[model samples]
Target: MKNITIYTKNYCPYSKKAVSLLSSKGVDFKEVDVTHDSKAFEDVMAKTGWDTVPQVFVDEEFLGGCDDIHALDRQGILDKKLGLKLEHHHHH
Candidate 1:
């Protein structure tokens, strides 16, 4: 299993959306809300060099925020990154 961690904020819609996507895939992830914690917010910003909510990391590597994750999903590789089995289908 991959180590998945998502840094989020309390009232951010993007944060909620990212969490929802991960949950839909049924993967375990750690969610850190930086809304009320200045130290946590600064830490995530320093690590990611981004001042945005929903910053994601997999296996201690930065993966980016909500938009990036959604883009990955659209490209059909999110499951791979999440360590989920890729669905197989016959193209006839």
Candidate 2:
């Protein structure tokens, strides 16, 4: 299983949601808060090439943002990407 990392700002609800989803799945991840650290912001920006909050990575592979991940889940591939065994729970 790959190591997961979530980069987000504390104020972003999407960020919280992403983390929540992973947490609910019993996934282990490292959270990097970029709200205060410029270096972290630059670091993530350079890595993901995105100026948006809530960037996710699995084993250094870019999985994308909140919306992107939700789309992945809808496509029935998110669990596989996260190396998890989550039940197929559709959102109401």
Instruction: Point to the candidate with the largest TM-score.
Output: 1
Q: lDDT tens string, model 2, 1-92?
A: 57999998999999999888878767778999988998988988998799988999999899899999889989989989989765787999
State the weakest 10-residue window (summed lDDT) of model 2.
Answer: 80-89
Model 1 lDDT tens row, 1-92: 78999998889999999999999999999999888998988988888799999999999778798999999999988989998986799898
What lDDT is obtained when candidate 1 is compared to the true structure?
0.90
lDDT of 2 at 60: 88
The models' CA-based lDDT, in order, is 0.90, 0.88
lDDT of 2: 0.88
Per-candidate TM-score against the hidden true structure? 0.88, 0.86
